[PDB]
Write a protein that holds these residues in place. Structure first.
Motif, PDB file in Angstrom:
ATOM      1  N   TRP A 135      -6.402  -6.655  -6.662  1.00  0.00           N
ATOM      2  CA  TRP A 135      -6.129  -5.808  -5.509  1.00  0.00           C
ATOM      3  C   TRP A 135      -7.385  -5.469  -4.720  1.00  0.00           C
ATOM      4  N   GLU A 136      -7.283  -5.534  -3.396  1.00  0.00           N
ATOM      5  CA  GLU A 136      -8.293  -4.927  -2.544  1.00  0.00           C
ATOM      6  C   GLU A 136      -8.214  -3.415  -2.710  1.00  0.00           C
ATOM      7  N   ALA A 137      -9.279  -2.721  -2.322  1.00  0.00           N
ATOM      8  CA  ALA A 137      -9.249  -1.267  -2.282  1.00  0.00           C
ATOM      9  C   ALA A 137      -8.068  -0.784  -1.441  1.00  0.00           C
ATOM     10  N   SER A 138      -7.447   0.299  -1.902  1.00  0.00           N
ATOM     11  CA  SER A 138      -6.294   0.897  -1.246  1.00  0.00           C
ATOM     12  C   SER A 138      -6.621   2.285  -0.729  1.00  0.00           C
ATOM     13  N   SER A 139      -5.875   2.698   0.288  1.00  0.00           N
ATOM     14  CA  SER A 139      -5.831   4.084   0.708  1.00  0.00           C
ATOM     15  C   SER A 139      -4.389   4.554   0.590  1.00  0.00           C
ATOM     16  N   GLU A 140      -4.146   5.476  -0.336  1.00  0.00           N
ATOM     17  CA  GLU A 140      -2.821   6.027  -0.508  1.00  0.00           C
ATOM     18  C   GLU A 140      -2.740   7.321   0.294  1.00  0.00           C
ATOM     19  N   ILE A 153       1.310   3.361   0.628  1.00  0.00           N
ATOM     20  CA  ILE A 153       0.211   2.399   0.624  1.00  0.00           C
ATOM     21  C   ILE A 153       0.647   1.095   1.265  1.00  0.00           C
ATOM     22  N   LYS A 154      -0.226   0.521   2.090  1.00  0.00           N
ATOM     23  CA  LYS A 154      -0.144  -0.894   2.420  1.00  0.00           C
ATOM     24  C   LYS A 154      -1.114  -1.556   1.452  1.00  0.00           C
ATOM     25  N   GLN A 155      -0.564  -2.131   0.388  1.00  0.00           N
ATOM     26  CA  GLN A 155      -1.351  -2.562  -0.760  1.00  0.00           C
ATOM     27  C   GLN A 155      -1.527  -4.078  -0.708  1.00  0.00           C
ATOM     28  N   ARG A 156      -2.769  -4.543  -0.821  1.00  0.00           N
ATOM     29  CA  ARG A 156      -3.102  -5.935  -0.541  1.00  0.00           C
ATOM     30  C   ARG A 156      -3.694  -6.627  -1.758  1.00  0.00           C
ATOM     31  N   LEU A 157      -3.029  -7.693  -2.182  1.00  0.00           N
ATOM     32  CA  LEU A 157      -3.453  -8.511  -3.300  1.00  0.00           C
ATOM     33  C   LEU A 157      -4.184  -9.745  -2.784  1.00  0.00           C
ATOM     34  N   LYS A 158      -5.345 -10.033  -3.360  1.00  0.00           N
ATOM     35  CA  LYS A 158      -6.059 -11.267  -3.074  1.00  0.00           C
ATOM     36  C   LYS A 158      -5.379 -12.412  -3.800  1.00  0.00           C
ATOM     37  N   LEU A 159      -5.307 -13.573  -3.149  1.00  0.00           N
ATOM     38  CA  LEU A 159      -4.792 -14.775  -3.791  1.00  0.00           C
ATOM     39  C   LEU A 159      -5.925 -15.721  -4.173  1.00  0.00           C
ATOM     40  N   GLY A 162      -7.100 -18.266  -1.575  1.00  0.00           N
ATOM     41  CA  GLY A 162      -7.426 -17.700  -0.284  1.00  0.00           C
ATOM     42  C   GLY A 162      -6.292 -16.863   0.264  1.00  0.00           C
ATOM     43  N   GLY A 163      -6.660 -15.851   1.038  1.00  0.00           N
ATOM     44  CA  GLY A 163      -5.689 -15.029   1.717  1.00  0.00           C
ATOM     45  C   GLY A 163      -5.201 -13.863   0.894  1.00  0.00           C
ATOM     46  N   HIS A 164      -4.332 -13.088   1.523  1.00  0.00           N
ATOM     47  CA  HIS A 164      -3.757 -11.917   0.903  1.00  0.00           C
ATOM     48  C   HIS A 164      -2.246 -11.996   0.833  1.00  0.00           C
ATOM     49  N   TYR A 165      -1.708 -11.126  -0.006  1.00  0.00           N
ATOM     50  CA  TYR A 165      -0.290 -10.996  -0.257  1.00  0.00           C
ATOM     51  C   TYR A 165      -0.048  -9.497  -0.338  1.00  0.00           C
ATOM     52  N   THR A 166       0.828  -8.981   0.517  1.00  0.00           N
ATOM     53  CA  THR A 166       0.895  -7.546   0.746  1.00  0.00           C
ATOM     54  C   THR A 166       2.225  -6.928   0.349  1.00  0.00           C
ATOM     55  N   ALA A 167       2.152  -5.694  -0.148  1.00  0.00           N
ATOM     56  CA  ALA A 167       3.331  -4.871  -0.378  1.00  0.00           C
ATOM     57  C   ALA A 167       3.239  -3.557   0.376  1.00  0.00           C
ATOM     58  N   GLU A 168       4.387  -3.101   0.858  1.00  0.00           N
ATOM     59  CA  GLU A 168       4.539  -1.731   1.307  1.00  0.00           C
ATOM     60  C   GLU A 168       5.008  -0.919   0.106  1.00  0.00           C
ATOM     61  N   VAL A 169       4.247   0.116  -0.247  1.00  0.00           N
ATOM     62  CA  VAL A 169       4.486   0.874  -1.468  1.00  0.00           C
ATOM     63  C   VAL A 169       4.756   2.333  -1.137  1.00  0.00           C
ATOM     64  N   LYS A 170       5.815   2.874  -1.729  1.00  0.00           N
ATOM     65  CA  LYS A 170       6.140   4.288  -1.599  1.00  0.00           C
ATOM     66  C   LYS A 170       6.339   4.838  -2.998  1.00  0.00           C
ATOM     67  N   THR A 171       5.744   5.997  -3.256  1.00  0.00           N
ATOM     68  CA  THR A 171       5.849   6.652  -4.551  1.00  0.00           C
ATOM     69  C   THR A 171       6.126   8.131  -4.338  1.00  0.00           C
ATOM     70  N   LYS A 186      -5.738  11.845   1.705  1.00  0.00           N
ATOM     71  CA  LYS A 186      -5.724  10.434   1.343  1.00  0.00           C
ATOM     72  C   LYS A 186      -6.517  10.207   0.075  1.00  0.00           C
ATOM     73  N   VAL A 187      -6.091   9.220  -0.697  1.00  0.00           N
ATOM     74  CA  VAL A 187      -6.779   8.857  -1.928  1.00  0.00           C
ATOM     75  C   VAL A 187      -7.242   7.409  -1.832  1.00  0.00           C
ATOM     76  N   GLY A 188      -8.553   7.217  -1.940  1.00  0.00           N
ATOM     77  CA  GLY A 188      -9.123   5.883  -1.986  1.00  0.00           C
ATOM     78  C   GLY A 188      -9.125   5.399  -3.425  1.00  0.00           C
ATOM     79  N   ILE A 189      -8.600   4.196  -3.649  1.00  0.00           N
ATOM     80  CA  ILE A 189      -8.347   3.677  -4.985  1.00  0.00           C
ATOM     81  C   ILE A 189      -8.860   2.253  -5.081  1.00  0.00           C
ATOM     82  N   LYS A 190      -9.540   1.931  -6.175  1.00  0.00           N
ATOM     83  CA  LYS A 190      -9.871   0.540  -6.462  1.00  0.00           C
ATOM     84  C   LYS A 190      -9.594   0.246  -7.923  1.00  0.00           C
ATOM     85  N   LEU A 191      -8.789  -0.784  -8.146  1.00  0.00           N
ATOM     86  CA  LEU A 191      -8.342  -1.206  -9.465  1.00  0.00           C
ATOM     87  C   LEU A 191      -8.832  -2.621  -9.731  1.00  0.00           C
ATOM     88  N   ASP A 192      -9.338  -2.857 -10.943  1.00  0.00           N
ATOM     89  CA  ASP A 192      -9.807  -4.181 -11.344  1.00  0.00           C
ATOM     90  C   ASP A 192      -9.452  -4.496 -12.775  1.00  0.00           C
TER      91      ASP A 192
END
Length: 214
Positions: A135-140, A153-159, A162-171, A186-192
């Motif tokens: 995942w790229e860094a997110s802003s929730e 969140i507009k949450q973006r996965l790296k492929l 190349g390129g990204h793959y995106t989800a619209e996320v609601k919690t 807002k919460v800045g989040i980075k997951l690895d």
């Protein structure tokens, strides 16, 4: 006082993705006021998984978000009873992940129980083909509504290729007792994924999360 500067957690997830059933158990630790944590997860049933770990990783911990003292830390305040959360991730190619989670403080550690259902991932898409790369860094974007705390969140996965793959996320996150809700922020989040075996039946992950005013 209840929540210390270092806390451990235990987690179990029961899930299915495109009808493939599995279970994961794990243990984590972190610094709740600093917003940092790690966990080690093991696939205990249904391994190896025939899909990307990355769709599961955001489901393994909102007690570990750094908050300025003027933004009520609603989810920390909810303990020891804790809170529940429910999430939908709508991916751009029609894949859907629905998640239900219960968080509590028991026997000196956080306890997380997760139920996950993923559906309609194209069989030749990046999730089912394991072509993702974190995942790229997110802003929730957070705001209270109807006595609960919502995040978007507009949450973006790296492929991998190349390129990204995106989800619209609601919690929706809801404390089990009425404690103080924050305003909008807002919460800045980075997951690895920091370590994994070849087939991702054992995985370690790290997340940093920090709340700030909008």
């Amino acid at each position: 006082a209840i929540i210390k500067e270092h806390m451990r957690f235990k987690v179990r997830m029961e899930g299915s993705v495109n009808a493939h059933e599995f279970e994961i158990e794990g243990e984590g630790e972190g610094r709740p006021y600093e917003g940092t944590q790690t966990a080690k997860l093991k696939v205990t049933k249904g391994g190896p998984l025939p899909f990307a770990w990355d769709i599961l990783s955001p489901q393994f911990s909102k007690a570990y978000v750094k908050h300025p003292a003027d933004i009520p830390d609603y989810l920390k305040l909810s303990f020891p009873e804790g809170f529940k959360w429910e999430r939908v991730m709508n991916f751009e190619d029609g894949g859907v992940v629905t998640v239900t989670q219960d968080s509590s403080l028991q026997d000196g550690e956080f306890i997380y129980k997760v139920k996950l259902r993923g559906t309609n991932f194209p069989s030749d898409g990046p999730v089912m083909q394991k072509k993702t790369m974190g995942w790229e860094a997110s802003s929730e974007r957070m705001y209270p509504e109807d006595g609960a705390l919502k995040g978007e969140i507009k949450q973006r996965l790296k492929l991998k290729d190349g390129g990204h793959y995106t989800a619209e996320v609601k919690t929706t996150y809801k404390a089990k007792k009425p404690v103080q809700l924050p305003g909008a922020y807002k919460v800045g989040i980075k997951l690895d994924i920091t370590s994994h075996n070849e087939d991702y039946t054992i995985v370690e992950q790290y997340e940093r999360a920090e709340g700030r005013h909008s």
